GROMACS .gro file of C-alpha atoms in nm:
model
  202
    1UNK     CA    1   8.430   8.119  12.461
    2UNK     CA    2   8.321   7.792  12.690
    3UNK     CA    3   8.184   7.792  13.017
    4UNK     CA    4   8.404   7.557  13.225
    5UNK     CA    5   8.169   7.356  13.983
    6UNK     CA    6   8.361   7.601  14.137
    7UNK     CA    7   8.507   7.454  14.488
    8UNK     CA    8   8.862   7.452  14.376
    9UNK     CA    9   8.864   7.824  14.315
   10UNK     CA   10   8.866   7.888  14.652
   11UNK     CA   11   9.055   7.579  14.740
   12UNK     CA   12   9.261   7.632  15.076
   13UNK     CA   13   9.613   7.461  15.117
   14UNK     CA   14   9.650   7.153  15.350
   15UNK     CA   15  10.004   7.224  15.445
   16UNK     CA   16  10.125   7.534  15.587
   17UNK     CA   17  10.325   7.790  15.275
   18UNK     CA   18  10.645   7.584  15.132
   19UNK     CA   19  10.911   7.791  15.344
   20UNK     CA   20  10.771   7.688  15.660
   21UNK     CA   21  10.742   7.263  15.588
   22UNK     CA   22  10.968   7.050  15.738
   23UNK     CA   23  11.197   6.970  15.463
   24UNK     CA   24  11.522   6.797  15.372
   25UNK     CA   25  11.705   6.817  14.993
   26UNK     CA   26  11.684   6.420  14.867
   27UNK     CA   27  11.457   6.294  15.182
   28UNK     CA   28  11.091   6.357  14.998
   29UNK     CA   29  10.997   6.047  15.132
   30UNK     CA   30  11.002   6.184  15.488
   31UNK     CA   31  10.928   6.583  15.372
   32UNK     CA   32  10.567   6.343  15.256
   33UNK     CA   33  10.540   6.204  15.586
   34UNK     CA   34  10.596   6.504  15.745
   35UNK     CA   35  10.327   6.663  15.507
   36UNK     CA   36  10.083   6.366  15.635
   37UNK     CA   37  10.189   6.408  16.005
   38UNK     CA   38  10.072   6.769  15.980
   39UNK     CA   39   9.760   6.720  15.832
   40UNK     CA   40   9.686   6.461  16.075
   41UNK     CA   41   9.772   6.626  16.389
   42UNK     CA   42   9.576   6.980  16.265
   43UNK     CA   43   9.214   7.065  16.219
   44UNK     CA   44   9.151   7.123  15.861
   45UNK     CA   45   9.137   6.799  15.639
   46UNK     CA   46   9.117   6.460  15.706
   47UNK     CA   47   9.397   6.206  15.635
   48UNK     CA   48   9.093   5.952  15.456
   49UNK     CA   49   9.158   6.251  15.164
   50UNK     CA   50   9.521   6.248  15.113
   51UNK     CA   51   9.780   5.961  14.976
   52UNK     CA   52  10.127   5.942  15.001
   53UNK     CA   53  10.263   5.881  14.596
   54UNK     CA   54  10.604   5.745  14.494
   55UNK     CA   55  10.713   5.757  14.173
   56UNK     CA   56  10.948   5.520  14.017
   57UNK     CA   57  11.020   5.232  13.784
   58UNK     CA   58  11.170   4.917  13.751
   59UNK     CA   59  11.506   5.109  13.641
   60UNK     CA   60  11.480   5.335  13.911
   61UNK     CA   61  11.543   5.665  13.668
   62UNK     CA   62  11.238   5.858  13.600
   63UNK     CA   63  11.257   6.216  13.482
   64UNK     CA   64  11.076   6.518  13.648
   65UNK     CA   65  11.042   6.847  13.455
   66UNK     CA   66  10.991   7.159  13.676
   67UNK     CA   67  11.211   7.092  13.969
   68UNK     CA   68  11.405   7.275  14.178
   69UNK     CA   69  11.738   7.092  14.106
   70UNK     CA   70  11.715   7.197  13.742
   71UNK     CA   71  11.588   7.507  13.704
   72UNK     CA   72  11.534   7.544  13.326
   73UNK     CA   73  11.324   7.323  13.100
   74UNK     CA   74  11.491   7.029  13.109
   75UNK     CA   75  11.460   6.739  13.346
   76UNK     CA   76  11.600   6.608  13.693
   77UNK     CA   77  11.646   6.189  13.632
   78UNK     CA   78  11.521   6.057  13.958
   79UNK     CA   79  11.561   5.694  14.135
   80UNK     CA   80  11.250   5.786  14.308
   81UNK     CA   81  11.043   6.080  14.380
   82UNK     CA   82  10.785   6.141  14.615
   83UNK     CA   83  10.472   6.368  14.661
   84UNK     CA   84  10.145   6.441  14.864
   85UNK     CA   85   9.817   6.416  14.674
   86UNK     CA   86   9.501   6.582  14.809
   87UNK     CA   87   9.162   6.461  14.685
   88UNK     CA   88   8.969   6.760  14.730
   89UNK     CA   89   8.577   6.785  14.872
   90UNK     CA   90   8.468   6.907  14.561
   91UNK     CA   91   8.649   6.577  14.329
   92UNK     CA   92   8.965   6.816  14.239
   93UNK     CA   93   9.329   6.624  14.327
   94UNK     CA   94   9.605   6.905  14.416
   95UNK     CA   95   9.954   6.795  14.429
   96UNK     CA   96  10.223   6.932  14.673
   97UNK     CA   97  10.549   6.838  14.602
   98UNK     CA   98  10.822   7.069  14.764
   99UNK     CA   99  11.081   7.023  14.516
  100UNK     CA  100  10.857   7.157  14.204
  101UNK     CA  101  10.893   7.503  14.034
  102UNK     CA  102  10.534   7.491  14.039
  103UNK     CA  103  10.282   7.641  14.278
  104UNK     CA  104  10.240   7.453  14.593
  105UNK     CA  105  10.008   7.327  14.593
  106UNK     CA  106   9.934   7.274  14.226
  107UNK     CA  107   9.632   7.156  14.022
  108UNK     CA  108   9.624   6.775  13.930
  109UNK     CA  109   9.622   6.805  13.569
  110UNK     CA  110   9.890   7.111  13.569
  111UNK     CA  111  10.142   6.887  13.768
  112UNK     CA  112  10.107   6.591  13.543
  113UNK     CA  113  10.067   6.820  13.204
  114UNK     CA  114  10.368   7.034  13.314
  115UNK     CA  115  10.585   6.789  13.555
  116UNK     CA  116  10.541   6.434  13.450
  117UNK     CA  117  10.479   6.528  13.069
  118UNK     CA  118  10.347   6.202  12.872
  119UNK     CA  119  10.508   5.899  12.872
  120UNK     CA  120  10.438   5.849  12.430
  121UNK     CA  121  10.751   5.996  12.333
  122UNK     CA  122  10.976   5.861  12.606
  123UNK     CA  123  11.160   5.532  12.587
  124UNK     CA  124  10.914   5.283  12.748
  125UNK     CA  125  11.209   5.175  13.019
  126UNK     CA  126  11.229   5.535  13.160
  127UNK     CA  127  10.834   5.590  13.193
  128UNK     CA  128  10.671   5.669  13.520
  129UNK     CA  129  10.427   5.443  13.766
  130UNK     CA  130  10.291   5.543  14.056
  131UNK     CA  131  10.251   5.399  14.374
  132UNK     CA  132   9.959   5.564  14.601
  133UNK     CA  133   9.950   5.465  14.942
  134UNK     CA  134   9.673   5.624  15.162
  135UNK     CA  135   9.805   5.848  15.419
  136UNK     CA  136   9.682   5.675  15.728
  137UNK     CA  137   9.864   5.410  15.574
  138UNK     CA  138  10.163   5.588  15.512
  139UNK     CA  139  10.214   5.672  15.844
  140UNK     CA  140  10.069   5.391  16.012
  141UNK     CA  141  10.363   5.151  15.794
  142UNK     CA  142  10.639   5.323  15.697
  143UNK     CA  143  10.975   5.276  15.799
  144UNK     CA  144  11.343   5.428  15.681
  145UNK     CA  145  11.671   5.373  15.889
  146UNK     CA  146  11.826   5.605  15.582
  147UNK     CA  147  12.072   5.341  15.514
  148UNK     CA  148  12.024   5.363  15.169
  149UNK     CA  149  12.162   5.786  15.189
  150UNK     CA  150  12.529   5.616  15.330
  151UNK     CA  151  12.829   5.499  15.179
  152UNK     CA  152  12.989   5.215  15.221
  153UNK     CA  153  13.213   5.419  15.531
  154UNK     CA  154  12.878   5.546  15.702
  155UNK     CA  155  12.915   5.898  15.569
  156UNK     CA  156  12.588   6.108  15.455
  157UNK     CA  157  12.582   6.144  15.107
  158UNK     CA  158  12.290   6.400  15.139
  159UNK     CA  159  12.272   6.576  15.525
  160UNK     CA  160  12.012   6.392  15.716
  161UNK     CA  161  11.688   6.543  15.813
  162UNK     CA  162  11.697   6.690  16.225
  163UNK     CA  163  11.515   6.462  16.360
  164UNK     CA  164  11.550   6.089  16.468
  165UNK     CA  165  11.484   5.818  16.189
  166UNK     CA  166  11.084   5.702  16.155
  167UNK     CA  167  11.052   5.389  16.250
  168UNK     CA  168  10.696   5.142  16.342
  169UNK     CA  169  10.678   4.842  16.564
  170UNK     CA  170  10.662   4.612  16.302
  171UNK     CA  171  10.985   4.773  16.086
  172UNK     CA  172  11.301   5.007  16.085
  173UNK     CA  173  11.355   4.997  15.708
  174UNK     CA  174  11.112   4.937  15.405
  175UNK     CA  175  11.167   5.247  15.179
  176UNK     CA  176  11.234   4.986  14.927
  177UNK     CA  177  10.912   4.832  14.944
  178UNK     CA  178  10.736   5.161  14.872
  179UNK     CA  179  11.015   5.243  14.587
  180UNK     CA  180  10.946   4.937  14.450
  181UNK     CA  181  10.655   4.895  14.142
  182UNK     CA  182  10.571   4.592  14.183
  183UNK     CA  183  10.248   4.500  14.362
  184UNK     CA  184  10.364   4.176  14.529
  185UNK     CA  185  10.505   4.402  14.762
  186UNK     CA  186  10.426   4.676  14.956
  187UNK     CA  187  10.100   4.868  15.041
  188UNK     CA  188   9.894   5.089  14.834
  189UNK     CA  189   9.873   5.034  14.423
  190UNK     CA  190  10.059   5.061  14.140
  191UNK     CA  191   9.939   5.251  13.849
  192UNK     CA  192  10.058   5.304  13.540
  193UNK     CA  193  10.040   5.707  13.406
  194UNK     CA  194   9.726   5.644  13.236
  195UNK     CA  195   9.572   5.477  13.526
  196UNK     CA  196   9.684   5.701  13.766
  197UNK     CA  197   9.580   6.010  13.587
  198UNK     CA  198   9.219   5.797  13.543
  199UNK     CA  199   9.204   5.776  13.883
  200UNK     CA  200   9.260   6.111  13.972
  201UNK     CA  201   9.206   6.363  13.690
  202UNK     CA  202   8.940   6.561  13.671
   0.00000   0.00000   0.00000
């Protein structure tokens, strides 16, 4: 036996339950924003707390156990994937990513145990980095005409979210420099597993 503070216990969700979030199949980029739009414009947490986090690499094909997609134990291969992290008042990070099997929201170190899975026994060119934007951030720069869910004759690979396409004064498409790793571009930073987990594991 080990004795293991105790604000996560009674940690309360940031987003309202997962059937009731705005949500698109293949648009987790905007199901985030949407996330960070709702925690702005309600009462409960501050947007200081959360981050918007892509995941991707140079390749652009990452695997992620535990999603929907793919029920089983086996992986979905990703070009990107995106999720909310919450830094909770108490130090504890909770991820919500509507497309995991998972709970929603789920513990840090369960999501990145159980989803990500370490990167040691993966060939190097499909491991994952992470790049962490803040949410005020997020929302205050992000920009995605959807272009990139078209083919070349304009037709929706994927069925576009219902509402109009997000869009800033100074932009009107630059998913790619959030999908992107490298930190010559873009907002946020780029972590590595390792550094990200650092960062935010318990």
């Amino acid at each position: 036996q080990n004795m293991e503070g105790p604000a996560a216990v009674h940690y309360q969700p940031a987003s309202p339950p997962r059937d009731a979030c705005v949500y698109s199949s293949c648009y987790s980029e905007e199901n985030v924003w949407k996330l960070c739009e709702y925690i702005k414009n309600h009462d409960q947490y501050p947007l200081e707390e959360c981050y918007a986090v892509f995941i991707s690499n140079e390749r652009k094909m990452i695997p992620i156990w535990k999603q929907q997609a793919r029920p089983g134990d086996g992986p979905v291969i990703w070009d990107y994937h995106v999720v909310l992290l919450h830094v909770s008042s108490g130090g504890q990070s909770f991820i919500y990513d509507l497309d995991t099997v998972l709970p929603f929201p789920c513990l840090f170190d369960t999501y990145v145990e159980d989803a990500i899975k370490s990167d040691d026994d993966i060939h190097p060119q499909f491991r994952r980095k992470f790049r962490v934007i803040c949410a005020d951030s997020y929302l205050k720069n992000f920009a995605s005409d959807r272009s990139h869910m078209k083919d070349s004759s304009g037709n929706w690979r994927e069925p576009p979210p219902p509402y109009p396409c997000i869009e800033t004064g100074d932009s009107k498409m630059n998913l790619n420099d959030f999908i992107s790793m490298d930190p010559k571009v873009g907002w946020g930073a780029v972590y590595t597993l390792s550094e990200f987990t650092h960062r935010f594991g318990s």
